[PDB]
Design a protein around this ligand. Structure first.
Ligand SMILES: O=c1ccn([C@@H]2O[C@H](COP(=O)(O)OP(=O)(O)O)[C@@H](O)[C@H]2O)c(=O)[nH]1
Ligand SMILES: O=c1ccn([C@@H]2O[C@H](COP(=O)(O)OP(=O)(O)O)[C@@H](O)[C@H]2O)c(=O)[nH]1
Lengths: 234, 234
């Protein structure tokens, strides 16, 4: 691939969707793959979305019965959406960048891992999942390997506040203590670089850490400048 | 691929494992991919096999909770086991044939389908499975497309008797009425060719139907002769 693939990572409600749609518009060479599960959320037919909608709501109702199915599908959907763009976009662009909202790595090492640590996945489901994940990506990930990661870093308070603001019903019960596990997970993974994964190149992937505690919706030029400077080093 | 891939299909206990190991031995050009789930069954600690054992026994205990997970993993395991042999075997062989015990088609159109009709998979799981199956094989099946099928045909009585003889504990409760659903499924798929699938080339795939009602363990030369004659037409 001659297209640069950057994932944007970070806590629930940190600002990823907002930042990713900001980026989209700043360049014709810049293109986005929104997170498939994002699509599913809202209240136009599509089979993935019918499935996604259903499993997402079953997830809220009973995670210990639907984590493995949700996370398997959430992942496949990601891989195919990212392939679709990798292969169908930015062909005439001279500096092509593809921004992935989140990645197959946060699928496994943040979200699936959490679910297993909450015992919503038992040892068999967790082992089956990582194996399938291992294999799925061993074959298909090859054109998906990330050139860089941007980390939108927000305190859990910030995140909680933003879940409020987003006002998406199903989300309003998410406690601070949950956002803090994820935050510790992200910190470990992208800041201290302690989280050892099964994808070796990850240990050498450049990370950009961006503080998004302060609202950036109308004031984002310095975040974009840091992105651009970052991109020119990859 | 210059290797010929033939799947051996048929009801539980019809004789596939037996016939497949018979074939293995008759030629250096002839090579087998045993069904992964077959592996899992016994005991007397590879990660697939720990997973496979666990989910297989959870399947016996509660199919309506584990059918999706079992059938997802049984299938991935098959795809990767067949890829492994497709790419690592029969390189120096002049007439190379790979015999697959069962296939990704019986995974879906016999076993998964059955489970869905038993209501062990709900509409979402069934829809997510076929889609994942569609997609998994749309990408990876390309070197797996079968050149031919052999159908080992046995009455359900025969099969039941053989489940008896195999003496595998977990299997001893399988009723005749279950083996007859599968048999009707196999008949519909490989005899009347009415079972319409999502893989178009399947409608033109040559099938060899072999009566294995009579024991063939010590008397198989005419079955092998039919196989060889079959193979020369592919
Ligand atoms: O600079 C920002 C970025 C985020 N948001 C708000 O935070 C909420 C959720 O943001 P987003 O969908 O981007 O979060 P994520 O996609 O990371 O989960 C929405 O109300 C956004 O408008 C905001 O007010 N200012
Ligand atoms: O011609 C035959 C075919 C089957 N068997 C026995 O019947 C049992 C079930 O057959 P198999 O395991 O091969 O069935 P499959 O599931 O592989 O179709 C095994 O113990 C076989 O040795 C036999 O004695 N003679």
């Amino acid at each position: 691939t001659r297209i640069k693939k950057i994932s944007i990572e970070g806590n629930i409600a940190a600002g990823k969707s907002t930042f990713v749609n900001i980026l989209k518009q700043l360049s014709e060479d810049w293109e986005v793959v929104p997170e498939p599960v994002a699509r599913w959320s809202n209240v136009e037919l599509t089979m993935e979305q019918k499935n996604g909608g259903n499993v997402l709501q079953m997830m809220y109702e009973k995670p210990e019965r639907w984590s493995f199915t949700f996370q398997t599908y959430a992942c496949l959907s990601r891989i195919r959406a990212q392939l679709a763009s990798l292969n169908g976009k930015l062909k005439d662009a001279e500096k092509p960048v593809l921004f992935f909202e989140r990645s197959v790595y946060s699928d496994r090492y943040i979200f699936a891992s959490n679910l297993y640590e909450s015992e919503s996945m038992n040892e068999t489901e967790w082992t089956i999942y990582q194996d399938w994940h291992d294999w799925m990506n061993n074959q298909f990930g090859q054109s998906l390997e990330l050139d860089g990661i941007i980390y939108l870093q927000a305190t859990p308070e910030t995140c909680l506040h933003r879940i409020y603001l987003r006002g998406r019903n199903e989300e309003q019960g998410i406690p601070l203590e949950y956002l803090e596990k994820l935050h510790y997970k992200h910190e470990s993974w992208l800041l201290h670089r302690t989280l050892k994964t099964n994808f070796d190149y990850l240990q050498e992937v450049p990370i950009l850490t961006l503080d998004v505690n302060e609202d950036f919706k109308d004031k984002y030029e310095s975040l974009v400048e840091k992105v651009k400077e970052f991109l020119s080093t990859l």
